[PDB]
Structure formats: C-alpha cells, structure tokens
C-alpha cells in the first residue's frame, strides 16, 4: 500500500527483533563497506530480544552523541548520496565488567566469517 | 561525589542541550580522528534544543540499527581498548526534502573551520 510505503521507516530507524531479525531489517552480514559485520547467529535471529542486548546497546550512541562524537561526512556516488560516519568509543578497562564486555563484543564482530 | 561519579553516563550516552552544550558533552570540534567535526556555532551552543535538530536526528541510527548497519571493530592498544564504528546512511535523493537535507547537513559538517 502507498501508506505503508510512504510511512516506511528508513534503515537507520528500524529495530531488529525475533519477528523482524537483523538480516530482514539491516541485510545480511558481510565484508562490503555498506554491509554490517556485527552479530552471531543468535543475535542475528533475535535482535533486541537477544539475552545480552542491553550490554551491547550500552555502547550505541544517542542521537546527540552520534553527531557529537563521530566524524560526519557526505559522499555522492552514482548510486546516491550518503551520510558517512566514523568514530570510536573507549572502554573502561578498570570496570569490573570490562573482561565480559570484550568477550561479548568479540563474539559478534565478524561472527559471520565462521558461519556454516 | 561518589554517587555522581558512579552513575555518570559515558560519552556515547550523553545528550547536548543549552544547559550542557556539544563542547562540554563531546569536546571541541576539530580535525583529529578522535574529535567530532559536526555542527555550526548554533548547534554547538544549543544541541538538541537546536531548531532543526529533528531534521538532523532523523539520520541518527537507533541502537539496533547502529549495530546492524555499522562495521564494528575492536582496537586493543597500550593506551586503551576501543569500540570502532564506521558506516553510511543513504539519503533519498528523490525525497522532496532532499535538497534541504543536503544543505542542512553541509552547514554543520566541518563548520568549525569558519569559526573566527
């Protein structure tokens, strides 16, 4: 329907759940520059229903922090126009949870490389 | 106080307003890789109180989309451990508001270079 198309949320405003997983919302994981690389099979199928999603989402920036911390640019290619962003979030290595944070994050970074 | 330090939000979870601007929350704008580069003096001063902030925040990714779309990495260095993120948000060049969106984003990208 036109109303569904006219009000359909863009990629950046979507939320992955069990009923609308990471692949459906954000595409399959891959090595290309416009492909996401984060998430094992569990997180991919479960999205924000993932058991440890709050511990992952603690590293996601607010809207203000996204535009406050990142290096923001705009690319124009034959495919269209893009708002590019790069940045880095420091982890507290003295936090008692630091060791668990690194293990959880490394479990999902490029997890698709080992997919059957 | 210890309670203020113990509950102090990390950089990525902060929100900039008139009472707590972009410089205080996310540091000065600059060209270094560690620095943010986005915002003219008005946005610096007003943060989410900026008049056109909803038009900018429409491009900020949700927590699920941040980890769904972005390329996530981990940098373990002697000076600390970082969560690195890069990505691109595609604009709709056929949207009637596209030309105004490009102007608004351009006005804030690297705007610190004009600052007298």
């Amino acid at each position, epitope marked *: *329907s*036109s*109303a*569904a*198309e*006219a*009000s*359909k*949320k863009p990629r950046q*405003k*979507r*939320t992955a*759940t069990k009923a*609308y997983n990471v692949t459906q919302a954000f595409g399959r994981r891959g090595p290309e520059q416009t492909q996401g690389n984060f998430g094992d099979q569990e997180l991919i199928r479960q999205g*924000t229903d993932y058991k440890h999603w709050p511990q992952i989402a603690q590293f996601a920036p607010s809207a203000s922090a996204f535009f406050g911390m990142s290096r923001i640019g705009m690319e124009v290619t034959p495919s269209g126009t893009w708002l590019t962003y790069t940045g880095a979030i420091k982890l507290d290595d003295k936090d008692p949870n630091f060791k668990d944070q690194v293990i959880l994050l490394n479990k999902h970074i490029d997890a698709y490389k080992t997919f059957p | 106080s210890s309670a203020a330090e113990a509950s102090k939000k990390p950089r990525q979870k902060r929100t900039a307003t008139k009472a707590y601007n972009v410089t205080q929350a996310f540091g000065r704008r600059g060209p270094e890789q560690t620095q943010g580069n986005f915002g003219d003096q008005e946005l610096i001063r007003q943060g989410t*109180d900026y*008049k056109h902030w*909803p*038009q900018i*925040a*429409q491009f900020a990714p949700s927590a699920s989309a941040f980890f769904g779309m972005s390329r996530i990495g981990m940098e373990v260095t002697p000076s600390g451990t970082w969560l690195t993120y890069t990505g691109a948000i595609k604009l709709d060049d*056929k*949207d*009637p508001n596209f030309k105004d969106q490009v102007i608004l984003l351009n006005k804030h990208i690297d705007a610190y270079k004009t600052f007298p």
Partner: antibody
Amino acid sequence: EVQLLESGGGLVQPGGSLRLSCAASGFTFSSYAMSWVRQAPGKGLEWVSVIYSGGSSTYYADSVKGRFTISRDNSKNTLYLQMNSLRAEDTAVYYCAKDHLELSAQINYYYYGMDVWGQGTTVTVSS
Amino acid sequence: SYELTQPPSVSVSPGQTARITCSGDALPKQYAYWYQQKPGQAPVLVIYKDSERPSGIPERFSGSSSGTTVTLTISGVQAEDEADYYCQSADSSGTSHWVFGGGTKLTVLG
C-alpha cells in the same frame, strides 16, 4: 494560502443519500492523493476513504465500503464523496484532507502528515 | 483491522510534562503522526515521522519512538495545549491506508 472548503452536509434519513464536495486551492491538487476523514459527535477521527492523484485508484474503510464513493475532478480542483445507504452511525463531521504526494519516477509516495484540513461539513442521519 | 492504542485521557498541571502514548504492532517499521484537535476545530498536525515538528508548532512539542510505542511529549505544558490528541500510522502489511488511534483527551488544569 492553501485551503480546503467542504460543502454539501445536511440532514438525511437512514437509507438516504448525500453528496459532499471539497474545493481545493493553494497547492497542486492534481499531484496529491486526497482523503475523507470523519468524526462522530464526541468520538475520534476515522479515516474513511482515499483517492489517488489521478482519480483512478480508491480505497475505503470497512465501515463505508460499498456505500460511499470517492471521486475527484482535477479540472475543478474538487474532491467528492457520494454517500449512499446512509445509516445513523454515519452522523459525523466530514473532513477533507490532503494525503500523500505522488511523484512519477515506479510511482513514489511522500507523506509528512495531514497538514492541510478543511473546516469540515456536518452530516446528520436521523429518522 | 490494524489498531492503534492510546489512553482515553491524560491530566496534567501547567509546567508539568505531558506524555501521550500510542501503541501499534507495525510502529517499529512505520512512522507515526500526531494531531491536536480543540473543540469545534479541525485537527492540526503537530508531529510527523515520529519526531519532526511542522513549521509554526511550538518547540515544547516533541515525539519519540520505542519499538511498538510512540510518545508525544509536551514539556512545560500550557493551558492552550488542552485538546484531543490523535496518533496516526499504517499497517506494514500494505493492504490498508491510514488509521487513527482512539484519541487522548489531555486536560491541563489552568
């Protein structure tokens, strides 16, 4: 200024018929879908019908399907709602509203809310 | 039928923060739009695409999204903000058009 002006409301008996009209000005009426939205006394807003920019495609809420017919005359910048088989529950204020813009690339639909409303015309269906 | 769910009424005092919620299964995928209606007047669009203000709407109106719930927030609510508020969206199935929430009567106590 952009403006929608409804007319044709009145008092009718159940099973009767009535034709509403909405005159548009201030915007390119022919590029926009148009919708009728109604509000029974003391109740909420209820979308009832839409007609696309070319007047060829129409959709109806289940409550008025088969009884109401929406049409448009782009040569007059006018929207119409032909209401047949009227019931008591059709008693409402009927609003004309600008719907999504259609651009021909695949036709794309662009929507920033119903920012343009008519002041409404009152329809009373009572025996 | 696809339904949007709002509370029937919210009561606030001036200066407080008014919050009107709208719940719908398709809201994680579909934008919401908010309308303000005073008695005997046509509705007025106050928020579109979850969080954006049309020109002329005061800055104290804001909107946010959290999965199946969208929230219209009026900070420092004023007596003139007393009205009926309606959320509007569409099912993601693509077989229907716009649908309004049931509406929320906001009383301000001025």
